[PDB]
Amino acid sequence: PHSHPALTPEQKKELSDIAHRIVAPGKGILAADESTGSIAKRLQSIGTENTEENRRFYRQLLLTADDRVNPCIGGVILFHETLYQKADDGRPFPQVIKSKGGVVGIKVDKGVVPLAGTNGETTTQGLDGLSERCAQYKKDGADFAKWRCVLKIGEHTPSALAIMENANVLARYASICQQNGIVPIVAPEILPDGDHDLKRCQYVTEKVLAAVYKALSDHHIYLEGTLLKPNMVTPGHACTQKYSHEEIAMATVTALRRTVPPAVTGVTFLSGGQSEEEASINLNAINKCPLLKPWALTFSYGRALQASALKAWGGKKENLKAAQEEYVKRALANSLACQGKYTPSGQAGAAASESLFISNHAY
Amino acid sequence: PHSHPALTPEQKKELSDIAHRIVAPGKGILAADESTGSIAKRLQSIGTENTEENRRFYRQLLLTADDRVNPCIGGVILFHETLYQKADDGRPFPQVIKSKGGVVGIKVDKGVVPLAGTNGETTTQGLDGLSERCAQYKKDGADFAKWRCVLKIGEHTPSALAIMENANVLARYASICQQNGIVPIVAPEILPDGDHDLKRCQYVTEKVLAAVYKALSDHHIYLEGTLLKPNMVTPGHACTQKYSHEEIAMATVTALRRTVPPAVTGVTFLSGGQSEEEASINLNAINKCPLLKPWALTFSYGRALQASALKAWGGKKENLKAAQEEYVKRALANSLACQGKYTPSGQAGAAASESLFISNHAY
Amino acid sequence: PHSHPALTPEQKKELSDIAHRIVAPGKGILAADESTGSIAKRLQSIGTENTEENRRFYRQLLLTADDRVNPCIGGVILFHETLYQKADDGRPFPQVIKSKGGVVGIKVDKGVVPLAGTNGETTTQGLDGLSERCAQYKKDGADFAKWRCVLKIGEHTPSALAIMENANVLARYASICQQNGIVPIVAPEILPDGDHDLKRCQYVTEKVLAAVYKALSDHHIYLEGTLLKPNMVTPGHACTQKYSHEEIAMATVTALRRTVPPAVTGVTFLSGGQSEEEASINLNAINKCPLLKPWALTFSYGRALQASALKAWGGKKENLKAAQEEYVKRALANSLACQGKYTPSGQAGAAASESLFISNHAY
């Protein structure tokens, strides 16, 4: 085929600049774009209600930390509502993140819907009018975006149709984003559920990353103006055989090494149902693995960067300072891990009180 | 490759029923689903401004036609606004049609959107919420829907990307429609512009369809409960090469046979700017073709049915008899054509009616 | 693709004329292409000497079937060896086939080879220097040729790579043939092995059939000059449920209706371990299935038309006239079968055969 410049060289420069500012060495992303119902679950768990004012409050907390976290966070992923929310001193949240030293992010997908004739599979929707939302959002104060899809490993899942769909739908969204100066973060989230061991996870991950990078090539997306946010190679949470961080490190680096091109600027690992300490330890391990790593390997933790701070606040407005402090600490730990310079804090077991959910309820 | 029934015998049986009723021998489709804008223009050229009760009376005129049209009409495709309009007595339009023996349909796409670095090509949107909307429409009166995808022929069009995407989006629309118990029509309209010859048009038509039914397969579409709305096979509007209606017939059926599996219940053609008489002549020829045709070949005419009828409107109820019979005659002509029973009927009348150039400043 | 003629109108016709003459009403193909090894399996199994002469005799035995067989046989496929073999009357085998009114065909494939990473599934080799061979074969008296690609239904098979590989390989073989003026017989044979039921067999047959034709489109294959040689949709040879001949028929017709374009001239069927009369019953049932099938449903049986003949023969040249009559008998039956006019006296038939699964000793 032959030439048809989708983006101008000027636009290309913009995307590269931004995509590169986010994944700077030592920085990572804080994912605080949880939807209304989702976050409602968090407030219920402690003893707090889920009101507008409260939401505005909790957010303001993580967002008002001291400048220790400044060289640690390259970006934050906000929820639509939060975008137009003001601080106590009247400062708009988007601007307040700017003052710290990071870029504004915004979730844009409109939830997953089911696929007919598949063993409980889904694809994500939300393309209708996307470009308009992006032009407006760029104007309002956001620079990049996050779009998620959900795949699961099982007997004979994911399906050819599922990997096919999501990978093309992700490329589709990506194209739109760039035409509006928005760096797209592609998130091919695989479920850590099941009795599949580590081997099966690595196998599934590769074939996915292959499917996603081909779809993007066909779609003419500017790789340098993108980011990848995948799951680490890990067995099902119900799996029997335990593995070491070294094995978890090797497996993850290997799959990416065989599927992610060096044009890609960064791989931002999500939390993935892991506790705070595990997340950090795995991040450090991945950045220690003796293999050639051309792209920055950082994090994009949601609750993995919160947990403590959450129950620290506990609704009790007076518990503010202590909470914020806990979170700041978790930020430093990660800043160190993404650069292979972190060391464990404690080998006891203060991690997750709802870990494997199959035996006797959850929400 | 493990199957999963997206539909049960009961689900299937229903979709297969609605499809056979609309394409029943003699019956064709009335596509009067023009958007508020597109119809505003149609009205303005006869002293009628873009006002609701105008376009509500216009929709009523056609709908309130003498029972002679009952058989000619298998199905009527409506728009959101019209679907919720009542006739001058109290009964809503869905019921006016149902009492006449036709089946109700609804247009559900949300227009087109520019593509990822292509040659001015596009893809169609409208998947968000489609699911609930399909159920609300079912509850309200729609038993079938319409989605339109537009292709273009050129030195490098349609592109490989173009074909793939437009085919994937139609299949996703199709599935969701079938779950909600609504028959989905697939309309992959190629453009009749440019100086492309008949062979060019035919050949392009062949690639796109092959990929379409192949896309339908991958999503597990119940072929028997669907309708294909293709652009008839003809050269470009700028072509200087004359062709008989016979040649045009051949290119059409030949193209169909090679890509349309016999499971498909019916194929309804579009006009494409061609005069209503010619649309009827061509349609009649396609049906007189010696080649075996396993699927019904009828019509879905909008302009080719409203042209003259509207052209004979002056203001109120005066032409509310003159106009009706006009469209009635056209229904009676096309009903014969879908049966190879349309006597040539030499067009020995006044000029064709759409946008006729008597433009200076009259009287 | 703008439009690039890969075949001329002159070229096309020749293909379609040969393609049609083979599948005329009553006609069917005799697949006596039992290779040097595969024949030994059925020759030196019963002690009969495996030798070129004995092989030479056997063929001429079937090839001398009087004029009664003529109308029943459209074409005969031979092994490379038999092509260059003459008869006792000094005449070379091809000339005799032709004087009978049948077309001469030959197997061009070079056997299957396993794929690394699959669960026992294979692909086929044999394209090297095929054009050269096709020229020599046309030159030598051959008008058509066949190539087989075998697939298997299992726990997780067939795999996407299986479907993809065998399908794209068939399309290549076909385009080589068409250029040399050779009618190709695509043969996606799915083996009846495994404890899978009827519906399952239909499902995996549907996807395999959708893939094959999409590939041909991409390769610019002329469907009007080809023949499809598939297997019948039946349960595995280890199923617990018995089904009626009407079921296998309805399952077979519906599947083809959902995948094969009306442009395809004919479909030749495989025996697949069926009894001679069982294959006969089935072929007759498919021809009377109330669904509208647009193609010629005929046979391409080998063992099913040759079983009794070998046995009747006994290696004694003195049983000649008996052995032939066994073949002739079967040809007639299936001649009546390929057109739904074959009913055993009484007009009621046998359903099951083995039943070593549909009883008590299966649980």
Next chain:
Amino acid sequence: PHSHPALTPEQKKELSDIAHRIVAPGKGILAADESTGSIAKRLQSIGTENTEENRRFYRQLLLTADDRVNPCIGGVILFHETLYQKADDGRPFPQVIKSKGGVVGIKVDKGVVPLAGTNGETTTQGLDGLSERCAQYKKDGADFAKWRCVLKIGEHTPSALAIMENANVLARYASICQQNGIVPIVAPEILPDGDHDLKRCQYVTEKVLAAVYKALSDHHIYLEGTLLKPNMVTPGHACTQKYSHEEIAMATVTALRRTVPPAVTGVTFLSGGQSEEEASINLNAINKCPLLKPWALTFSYGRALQASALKAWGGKKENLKAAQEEYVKRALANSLACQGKYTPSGQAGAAASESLFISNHAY
């Protein structure tokens, strides 16, 4: 999809070992696999008869030089013929090559065959018997194989079919090599013929390479035990534009970086028709590209090493030492180039080269 191993750790390791040995710092590949007809091109030129005698003596001349270039050549590819020839010492050529400290490789493909419906595009053959052959070659001393794929850019080429077909045939070739302990060097050769610009070539390159590795994924290939032999991104032979060596590099490295997985152990650039001098200059430049280059960039040159050495021969025995020192000369400078340590840019205007398409005679 489902997990299915193809190679054991035993095989993987051995594969990586040979691969890394070849693409070692300072080492590159000598391509002396010139078929009888190809050899007859220049042997006739240097007044020497085309006989196995001098053909043997020529290849010998290349091997029997001084060990000053041993660190230079890591691999040598020959023709089937030379594999079983011997030197004046009495020992076989592969012995000579092994003792000299180099890996023996052989060409397995059987030329290019034309594809119908295309604008003069081909695809390679050879797969038949491949496995049996490679087994024979390895036992004989061969360790790596070569397969040439051809791709010409044009106003209508490469076509999807050309890119699809050719990529899968390479995946097939590799898989078989792996199962036989042979390291497959895949090479999608882009042709410099045409008037096209530098950007156009890069655009196509990126598309091709994306399709190549995608196919490698589905076929379950071990990329660590594979090598890539691509062309450098340059303008067409009839391009009226002038480009600087560094600019040529940039474009080439970007194409690779945008599509090639870190897993790929080495990238052996093909001569492509440049003068020995610039072949080294461009390769040299490519290594000075400040962008991250995670895979060895080296050479796979034939004429680019033998060119001057041929002139210094012309079928004479008195010039043994003569011709040799020219080869040693060529090899060394390229070892330095593969290290980015070859004399910088400057020598571009003392002699210039064939570029009549850039003078006033191109109008």
